[model samples]
Target: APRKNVRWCTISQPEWLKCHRWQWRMKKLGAPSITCVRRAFVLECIRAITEKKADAVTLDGGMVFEAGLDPYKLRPVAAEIYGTKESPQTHYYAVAVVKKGSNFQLDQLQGRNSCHTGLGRSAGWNIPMGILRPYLSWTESLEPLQGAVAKFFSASCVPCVDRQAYPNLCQLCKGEGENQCACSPREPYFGYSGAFKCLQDGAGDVAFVKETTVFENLPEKADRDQYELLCLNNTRAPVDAFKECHLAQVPSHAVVARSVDGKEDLIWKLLSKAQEKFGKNKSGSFQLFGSPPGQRDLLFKDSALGFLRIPSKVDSALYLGSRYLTALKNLRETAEEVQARRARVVWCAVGPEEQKKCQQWSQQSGQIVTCATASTTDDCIALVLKGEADALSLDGGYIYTAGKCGLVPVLAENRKSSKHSSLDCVLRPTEGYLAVAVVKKANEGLTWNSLKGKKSCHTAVDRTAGWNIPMGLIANQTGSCAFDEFFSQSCAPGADPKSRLCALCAGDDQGLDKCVPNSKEKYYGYTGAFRCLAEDVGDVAFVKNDTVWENTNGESTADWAKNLNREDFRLLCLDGTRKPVTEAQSCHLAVAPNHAVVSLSERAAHVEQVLLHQQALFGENGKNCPDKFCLFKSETKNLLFNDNTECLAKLGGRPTYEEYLGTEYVTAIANLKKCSTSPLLEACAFLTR
Candidate 1:
């Protein structure tokens, strides 16, 4: 039979008994037994392990290992070395533990005396001291509770004590002999009561007491004076006190254990059995004298045997259970499911007309084809070029124009057309001519030869108009001339000859008899009669041709005859070809109507030559040709033929402006102007100014 085990006890006897009973039951069920003790014994055990006081004892094996003692050093002498198994274990045991009505002012206490219940035996001493060690200096440790105890006393620096030692210390401080002190017998209670009484009297500032003691013993009025609970110390009394006083949890202690031979396994087994008993019974269990792993195993083995109890909160337990079940269900479903779905292939039709035709063809052939319209010609072209459309219709002119402007042409001309003599034939039927011409105001003065000397206004040059038409015609006419030479010789380079230069001259109303018939008048003649005006001395002037044709119907048959009685203005025959008419000479060179261009062109030549020869003769003294001098030949064909039947019978039908107004005559006048000195420079200056 085994020797009877002494039961562990503390002031918290009931709780200790409860924990022990659980371990006892585990042992009866073939699990190892473990002790559950009061906080004092636990602290004492820890101090012994740390201080090495029990190094030689058998139970001390676990204690040494838990304290991290070197196994190699102990192995030589010890029969069995301990690991973390039976060392005093610390655990989270929270409680509200504070004295009520304690007038603890935190700031005023520093460097005063204090005593805990035999330092190594109580959590009241060990717990807070450990917590504060890191924050305090080495010098502070030497003074013990001096720094802490000052928080309670204001008037004097005094030593504090537990209830057990207070009276003796107080008596000694009174100067009585140590043996004769009145408080010697009452020391413990005096110490305890004095500290608390000082708080109530506003003399002491702080105290530590079990919350249960305060709850169970303190007067009701004392409740209002409670201070903050500082920490949760690992002890039964403190834990119980927290529940009674409603102290908040601050920190917890971890379980620490030592390892010994085979006892390590046995101890863990005992802890597991205890945890199972607690879990199933809702009663406390004996704590394993080791770390969490040693304690965890206790719950694991019992849970596997179905002895562990469900938590009291059904909703919370169910929530956790459901989460696990859902996760398992998902995993199992995943195993039987197929992979994800894919997108379907889409088919699209080609072009508008083609698509429509294809739809019709499909209907006729009983095949399936979807039709859609291509929104634009470019879209249709793109589709055809990409092989998406089988056929496309495009504007032929637009395609050609686009090509000219650097766009790629998609359609080649169909050579298979019935009218296709060339590869440029249109594949599809088209409308009337889409002819584009560079039409400007018909400048009466501009012609193939005239254009060589005069600046021809154009629509575009690098394109189809501008310099292109004039330059092309010039190139065609002057087969032997280089472009540069032709441009320079035929026309002064860069001259604009149509610009105005000088004002036309007008005279006073009176007619001079000496200058009469030669004098100026605003209106000088009747419709067909000559009212001779003085010849203008200026370089150029408008002249009325004094020639006419007779008709029975008063209609002229001559091309240059304006009308039977209407005046036809022309270039005056003023050059040396006819002597300058004297004031006495009434006869004038009557301009012929049929050959107006020939007459005007000859007269223009004569004037230009005379002007040039005069410039040479006078060398800048004589009247000079005004800058931008120009001559124009009117289309006399319309004037000559009043009735189409008469002109057609007489002049081989009708004639164009160019055909009737001889090109050579036009060319000669244009060339003469080009030969004038500094024509372009003078023209440019006159025009710009």
Candidate 2:
């Protein structure tokens, strides 16, 4: 058994005393014991956690970002829930407040005194500084940002900032002697209420604090109405208008733990039970969120109701969100570096081969293109969701998952049209690809109607042409949901390795990692499924129309596909008839939306702009195609995209995934998923909210 004693980190002496009482209370109640670990600073607590000396510590959103960085990758396990019982929130607004008759807007704050809650705090420092960064004429490498801020404001009180380095930053402090500019509450003008008091006392022109500060301090409508909020548009609004006038919406403070074996479950159990027994007026003897008269916010926010468990998949970046994460990173980034990051597009590649090709494309595109790789497509999608990677092309089934995860489609993969094409590929509208069932011509009776009890091959589960369309049709025809029973022995890449569904799958050349839903699995993706049929491992394969054409008739030069001829495969039509592969247009299961690029809405425009430019230089008819590198040509069969792609065409009118994938198709995928849902899809859906 484990120690079951959760060690909670304490930053201040007052916090440590509070933790000691909490440890006694928990022990008296026969709950998990709490051992307090003392640390002089927040960063030290983070370091202690990484060294396995401390188990957990609650941190502000800004500190959470730093804790998640390299060397000590702590993750937020639970977030402090704030607001009223009826409407609890896991986030807060950072507002900039000023007196009503100040006669100046946010943009006119130069030389005016400012009051900050504290240095390195979310609302007090990070959000306000991020909003004012463009206006602050600070050279990132020349000097510290505090120097620039001191010069920007005439004289101000900013707590927890170095007075020796910038005296102007502490000029208005009301504390006496050595306490005048102290980092702790010894300073007269320190935290939220104190910063607002500085503005109330007229020592500062503006106060950067949380939205709840004014309401908490004033307590009366008339007093609250005497102040206003600074809007980013150089305007002012009522103090309560923070919903529209705030600098930024930041996540609430969270309890962070070691990224690996942090004992999060034990810590969560302790917090959950403690909050129930001692939370918010639960007991007078030991209030979990309360502190003695002189000390405040000892262990957690005084206003926080309880803790909400953060989903395990949410790392630091995701917990902070894209906007806040970018602003936090921008605090230290040079203007040129920021611009470069914005200008470049980082493509998400799945597995090593795609990573190799992406690196080639990255080098050829003058570095406008960059690459990020994950072992699986789901991981890649998660990377894109977390804002670590920009975009990736996804199948329609995956497009559905990505759309559910709040990613928007940027461009479509347009191939040669069904009819004669006088139009350029980039300008022509996309004719969706056809999902077809392919079988060996020699297997004469193995048509779509006769697929039951036959060994089968599919590109992968949760794929458009491979699984959704074909399985949806099968489920509808049989009026049964037992797909695994329908096929005697099949190879579906994502299925359980020991199941009959994966029985026909051949592993990598070395014969390891069988039936994995990635490139490492030999029988995976469009080419692998077709190869399964060509090698007679399965009776039929569910793939797209182009797969049969692209792999047969010497179209692909790979060892598995090189000698295969078009005459050997037959398209199994829905009408129980078999036709030559050339007649796929009339003999296909369903019309599937073309694979397309998807990215977060924040990066959609930039990603679209960079991708369009990259394609112009490395496309099928690109200027440096054969000589330099090709964006779409992969000799081993569809690497990052379809090998036959002409260009990454604009999504005309820029339809949503629901719009891009027609209503009928989306409904069909939904219907099929009802029988058996994808675990990845379920996890992504949960993470989205």
Candidate 3:
């Protein structure tokens, strides 16, 4: 005989299954033998402990914490039992399987309400109220607590327990018998059943119950719509409350046995071995799940504490109690470790050959060094300067530039004089950089020349890759010459024959290209010509460094070549000197023989040959001479004779906007007709052609 062994049975609700599973696994490893029981018995045991009928009982902290009990006050009970003043035994600690939402700060829960079981239960009452009390009651007002309290009542209470049943009756009356003389119309709400009824009937916000009662029959008894446990908030105070309320220091179904012979040391050793069995030694049969290692600290300090306990034999009761002390002591130390691990450093390649050297150095140092291939020397320097990279390995040129720009050189490939010399430093690996660029397909028009005259679109005008260096380079290479010329020409006085009146009239700097009508009529160039003609146009029009050419038509054809070389149409030199006329001139006549002879005294024969050639080419083209003459004559005749003759028939017919219809209706109809047709009708015809 084993001394009339009294096996303890623990009841766990479905809400506490995770906690129960952990408890069961711990018990299986030799900690204690806990038998699963119904809700009534679990409550009876809890009642017995409270009433001093039982020597001690194990429970989860969440129940007690939620009931507004102080864990500091409860821990002394277990502390006394453990027989330790400074160092409490495993039996002193308790596990709190709190839903994550219960630990939220009151401010964070203002809009987002919470849900939990009845306020007397471990999870429902103890854990939430305990952990959240500090944050919710920062102002010391219970009003904010009421919102969270009401939220739990509204959302958590469901499938109300029957108070008039066998087990329910026993739980409510604390197993003293419902018909007892002392028991009046109602027994004081004490145990799990009473707590559950209080929650279901809206007397309390949350309900705490044993796992057996909630899990064993809840699925069948619960309505289709019911509450569920989403997350756990495990911490010191909450864990302690869970132990007092549920009677088991560990999760839901844990069993704590006092040695009959008072062999506390032997029992402690046995419990340690049992905990080890379910510790790292165990397989997936029992394991805790939550956020990963790095994210755990941000969520809760208990996550790290709980993980630390995985390798220890200490019960949750003792572990939670010591966690607060540990956290206070090691907070600074842990923060330093996290910061050191999170800091980043980078090694960048500065130039071509230096890039290769950097890679070799990176390999030797065991660091992540990047060789910037597509990026420029300036870009690599910028990366270092902007703190995107810590070091750059390149040539003296890049290093000198970087140094000039206040960027520290970590590694240098070349050294000229002391002023130009570069230095090297230890390279380190760092977090990967985020480099974003707008990349186009290779086939897209991306050449410098192609981009010259096009309107470019980018993320921002001053953005690094968009409009900064790239646009600066483009403007420097293609726009400087034209801008200089425009500025110089526009500033010249009207008396200066070389002045670009036409350019000024076009508003060139404003990006306006079209000429105002009749403005060109008075402007004179090298040929003493004002009108636009064949010689004014050419295969190339140099604005700045950029050359704009007509690409839509054939190259150097009779139509284009003749017009381009015409003396009257050509651009004047800086001094308003005319270019020699050539056979290619097709629009205006050359100067008279005497005038040409006087003008080109040294190049007289050349002038004569050019004049003869122009006459032959222009005169040979019948359409250029007689046809132009006939067209001018015809235009004069039409202008002078057609107006009254044709209009005499229409002179009597005049319909004003009002005569046609009221002005508004007439204008509306006209607008409607114009809108009905596509505005690009002429362009559409051009495309078809």
Candidate 4:
């Protein structure tokens, strides 16, 4: 059933009177009812709606965020539009305005006197304060943000702030003794025009207000030309340049309703009718978007054109947009949460062995690097997206999934450069690694053509060298997608564990975690896949060329691989011929992209900074590698990173996964997925939606 009556919440007597008049007019017009619900303040109105005492309330951009918090979970139903017909805007610019002759810029506001529209307002408090948070010496535990603002400016008039608690904040107010810095109009320096007047009267050096305030106050171009805007780039711009110089673009004030059982339809219908009949002097009987002289913005903004229905999918936070939402969040965060996140990097480790190594690194690094564990690479990627984890190193296949979910790569795992390469490992462009199909020389007549029904070993599904390149090529040649049928038995982690794909998998030493796509599984990575072939469990192994050189010919010191000889292995060429492992340069299946560290775009810079510092201390050639701990090596090999990694190289440029993986490889992977789609891709898609 549709809700017929909307209880309009009011904060003050003026608003209550205006709301009552509107109710009478709306009733006389034969529209759905509007009942006035009087409240002490915006927060009370928010509480009233949550408690079912009222149905809806109009709120500023900041209060919209506050009301959206838990226990008072309300959403914006309708937004008020501003500006003229030619360029009507559902948003406004929060700008810092100052006299053109003032010898100050944005960064120079630290010791100046300032004026604000009011406390808790978007242009006045939230946006400007958030933009200047880095300069504030205050932390949440020490003092409230208002106190920090009081200290930042020598003296100022920010109406609605507690003058007793922060006297300096109200020091420049023009109000009489008792009315000084009052929240209401009793204070002479309160709203946008008043705040601008405070600066005009020489009571303040600058005023934080919306872009329209100056044009509205000074009708003459000469008077408007006397003012300029403070740009974020530490320069001054003409007042009209707010589009390029504002602190933030804030969404307009909106009518908020309870998330559940909200009468959005009725509210929107009533607003549509009210604007049509009594909008902007449409009827002298009453004005829906105007207030009497000497009184400003009684019910809604005096300048509002009309109300526009907000999309049902947009909750309060979504309506506010990321920039404005972030500004409001900054005001509510504690110093500890801020500093803690900045001081440390929380790494997402895949499985038991990687978790163990991560913890060791955490302890040795004095907890600057911490550990978050997941069972699979996809799970780790999900953790990063949820912000529970900071970052993780991922294969190109997983990077594609992460990138699709709004994560970006920060650094690449660089190995030893070719002898002909001139640049240092950190500066050189990455030459992709070779993916090869390896087999024992003893399997004499068993070539690529005759291995259709043979047992196989793979590092894991959705991995470049292990699964995508080799399986993709096989699918192309066979003209079929049934890889399980092509290989009689195989160990492909991240596949059905009970199926033939996992038949040859050896779990951990204790026989747990079989066929898992993590280090916990014994046959889970490059070295593990090679081990499956070395032990004669599979006829062929799909792995990287480097895996053969790293684990054979006395290169590895592990008990099971110590006596292995490089000469015992052969590379299977795509032309149905077999050659020595050293011929991989010509016999390789594909050149796969290198692994890289992935994180949310917001955390990428800090994560990169911390990792670079960490590697300098514990990297392959670090001062602490031999004495304390190594970040790139483990006894079982490639625990948290590839054992052969020389450094976490800087990406030559910030590249998206599609760009890093190359168009050809991405298209190939896309084609391969036409047969078997990735479950992780589906899971991430659901999360984002």
Q: How close is candidate 3 to the true structure, as a TM-score?
A: 0.22
* Candidate 2 off by > 4 Å: 24-30, 155-157, 170-188, 197-203, 222-226, 278-286, 290-292, 444-455, 474-489, 494-507, 511-513, 575-579, 671-687
lDDT of 4 by residue, 1-689 (tens): 22588888887788788888898889878877888888666778899988888888888798788888897899988889887756777888899999989788777778789999888888877788888888888868888889788899999998888889898988898877857887765577877788888889999889998888888778899889999999998999999898998888788898899998888788889899999998866899788888776656677877788877776656676667644564566577875675776679999999987898999999888899999999998888767755668899998777878887678889999988867356776777677789999999998988888988899899998889999898888888878878779889999888888888899998988898789999778888988899989999999999999999888877888776888889999999989999998877799988989998888788888999999888988986687877899888886468888887888999867788888887898888888878865555664443343
Please provide, for model 1 over 313-424, each residue's C-alpha lDDT reduced to its tens digit, 9 standing for 90 to 100.
Answer: 1111121222122222232222123111001100122223234443543343223222334533333333322222222222222222222222232222111233534432
lDDT-better candidate, 1 vs 3: 3
**How does each model score on lDDT?**
0.26, 0.85, 0.28, 0.84
Candidate 4: residue pairs that collide: none
Instruction: Summarize candidate 2's per-residue lDDT along 1-689 as a digit string, tens digits.
Output: 24588888887788889999999899988866888998666778889988898888988898898899998999989989888877888889999999988789878878989999878889988888888877799988998789899899998899877788898888888788866876655676877778988999989999998888888778799889999999987899998788898888889999999887888888889999999999877999999977776656677877678998876767887788777888888788889888888888999988778899899889998888899998878788878866779999999998987887788989899987757567787778888888889998998878777888999899997899999888888887778877779999999988778788899988788898788777778789998999999999999999988888888877778888889988888999988899998877689888888999989898999988988888888887788888898889888568998887888988678689899887998998888778776555665654555
Clashes of 3: 42
At residue 341, give the lDDT of candidate 3. Answer: 22
Which stretch of 10 consecutive residues in model 4 shows the poorest summed lDDT?
A: 680-689
Candidate 3 structure quality by residue, lDDT tens digits, 464-571: 222222333344454442322322232111112233423322212353322221112111111111111222321112110000012112322334232432222222
TM-score of each: 0.23, 0.90, 0.22, 0.62
What local lDDT score does residue 469 receive in model 1, on the 0 to 100 scale?
A: 25
Highest TM-score model number: 2
In model 3, which runs have C-alpha deviations exceeding 4 angstroms? 1-56, 62-122, 130-137, 140-191, 201-213, 216-262, 265-318, 321-689
Model 1 regions more than 4 Å off? 1-24, 33-104, 110-123, 126-205, 209-251, 260-262, 278-689
Higher-TM-score candidate of 1 and 3: 1
Clashes per candidate, residues 3 or more apart or on different chains? 34, 0, 42, 0
